[PDB]
Amino acid sequence: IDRLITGRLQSLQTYVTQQLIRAAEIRASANLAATKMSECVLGQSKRVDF
Amino acid sequence: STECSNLLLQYGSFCTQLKRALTGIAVEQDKNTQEVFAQVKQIYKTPPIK
């Protein structure tokens, strides 16, 4: 039971760490999308290729 | 070693997700280089007069 508990805890910790990294990436994309909604939809942008 | 491989098979799929993570990083590096440098459609050239 100790062996199985250690293995399942290691796998679940790996899942939580991967979810945290993906959450950071998704938060960066959502910040970019919020900037685009504030600057393209609500105004006219002079930034090139934006 | 065959005995180490037989014991490593019992741990499940840690190595598959490690390989998937490294493959994702290796694809993302080329995506970074392509999205930074390849922003031009045609390869321009300067005239022979300098």
Host H or E run for residue B46:
none
CB A14 within 8 A of CB B17: yes
Place of tokens 């799929």: B13
Interchain pair B39, A49: CB under 8 A: yes
**Category of B12 on φ-ψ map: left (φ > 0), alpha (ψ -120 to 50) or beta:** left
Write out the E strands in chain B. Answer: none
Q: Which residues of B touch A7 (CB under 8 A)?
A: 11-12
Given in angstroms, what resolution was this structure solved at? Answer: 3.3
Expt. technique: cryo-EM
Q: Does B13 touch chain A (CB under 8 A)?
A: no
Q: Which residues contact A44 (CB under 8 A, 6 or more apart)?
A: none
Q: Which residues contact B11 (CB under 8 A, 6 or more apart)?
A: A7
What are the distances in angstroms from CA A10 to CA A7, A14, A15, A26, B12? 5, 6, 9, 24, 12
Which chain A residues have any C-beta within 8 angstroms of a chain B C-beta? Answer: 7, 11, 14, 18, 49
Q: Which amino acid is at B40?
A: V
